[PDB]
Amino acid sequence: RDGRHKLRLTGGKKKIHKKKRKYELGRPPSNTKLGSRQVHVVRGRGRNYKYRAIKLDSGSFSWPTFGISKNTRIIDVVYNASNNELVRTKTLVKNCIVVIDSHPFTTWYENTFGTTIGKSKNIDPLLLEQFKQGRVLACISSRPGQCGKADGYIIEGDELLFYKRKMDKRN
Amino acid sequence: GKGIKKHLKRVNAPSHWMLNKMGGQYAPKTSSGPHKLLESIPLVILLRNRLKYALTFDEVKMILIQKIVKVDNKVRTDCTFPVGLMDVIHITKSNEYFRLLYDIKGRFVPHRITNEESKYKLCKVKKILLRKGRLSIAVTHDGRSIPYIHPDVKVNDTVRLDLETGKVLEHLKFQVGSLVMVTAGHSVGRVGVISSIDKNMGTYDIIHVKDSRNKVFATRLSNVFVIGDNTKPYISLPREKGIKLDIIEERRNRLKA
């Protein structure tokens, strides 16, 4: 919304002037949770539409090594970079780390390489074990509250290690 | 509340128009269309205030409602439709053809054009865009898209343009030694030849222009319109031909007639 009612650059105080306009703009935060797809269309200035996802379960997750994407359910939200409240309460944001079902990707790898176009350079053993046990960590990257969908990427190596340490006197 | 301002006062309206102080509260406000508000004439101004083919706005409406006048081979009843810097008006009933040109007094004038030569215009491109499939569209000073243009033509080039098919007869590369018309700025409403181009980095490109009295002046690149070549002027200018007489010379010349 407005900034003119906030403190002056010196730290000084500025009198209230100009009654509130439409186009200063700003609305309540997204609450998007885990549940069957439900969305409300939001009407922005100029008739510009935004899609407010209120519940979703299955997003578009990208295996970036082969650069390929499939729609997959998210099992759980496991770590959030911005704060611990959002992950504990289960509200998605574009820097949530979620867990995805690995089966479409696992099928695609099996079809393409013949053991578990294409680069075919072999997946790393820690990540491969995780794909086998179905506990696949992925990072949300779209903004569900704006675009109506929570779409993400499969994490690996240094991003995997950093977020695993972030996720969990003592050790 | 707030939004689109639909009126134009008499005093506020452009000096170029020649709308006198006592003559009304308002001026006509142009429809969106071929040229910018400051850089155009509506049909009401052209019919009544320039041509004087009507006494009043009502008499202009009586002319317009009929099928008689066509611009760009298109009949128009639209009073505040803007006719821009340079294009061809045909009035079928009086058998008249007018090409729009700048005066030396910085106002738009209708210059009588030959019946055959009415076929074509000379059109400056302002931008040229590649759309899907790597497929060209040029964008003109008069707000027209010219699709499918050859890549030889560049973003300040002028082009001779048919009005029946809407497409190009020939084209002129922007360069030093090209006859140029100034369309805005200090030197507005004059014609010269490009003497020299010097690039300006991150800031306004300035172009040096020579008059036909062999006098040199600077002008900003945005508001110089190529209009012919060193070999020939490409279109029918009015008799004055954009050439600058100073006031003392001009008043003495007027007196000596």
């Binding site: 090594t65 650069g67 950093f162 977020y163 | 980095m201």
Partner: protein, 146 residues
């Protein structure tokens, strides 16, 4: 080390699946740092490899504070004309400017900054060249004119 913060630090144009960073050419009399190309960092507020648009005015000032993280303050000192006395008076203005993590910046350095795109409330500018220099006494209290 790196990534002391809660989130991984990355930036667009890394392109390390194909592997054929995002360092820029930046234009207008500024040759892009070698230190941007080879540096340990990766950043978005850096004009030499972030998404910053170096647009509008290009100004000079004198650095007064380097205390803030990633952000530095310049004073631009100048003479204001008073018509009645036909004479000048000292005036000056403080501009908070993004630092760029490639550079070393110290007090009394001259810096050529650009108008660019503001990314924070009081920050406006971003350094395009740091001209290494020094001045006697406190820079904030010192009058240097150019």
């Amino acid at each position: 080390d790196v990534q002391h913060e809660r989130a991984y630090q990355k930036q667009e144009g890394a392109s390390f699946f194909n592997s054929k960073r995002y360092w820029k050419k930046v234009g207008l009399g500024f040759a892009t740092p070698k230190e941007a190309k080879e540096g340990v960092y990766v950043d978005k507020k850096c004009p030499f490899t972030g998404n910053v648009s170096i647009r509008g005015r290009i100004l000079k000032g004198m650095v007064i504070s380097n205390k803030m993280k990633r952000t530095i303050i310049i004073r631009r000192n100048y003479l204001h004309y008073v018509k009645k006395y036909n004479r000048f008076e000292k005036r000056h203005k403080n501009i908070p400017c993004h630092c760029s993590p490639c550079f070393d910046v110290k007090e009394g350095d001259i810096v050529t900054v650009g108008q660019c795109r503001p990314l924070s409330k009081t920050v406006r500018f971003n350094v395009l060249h740091v001209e290494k220099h020094q001045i006697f006494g406190s820079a904030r209290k010192q009058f240097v004119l150019f």
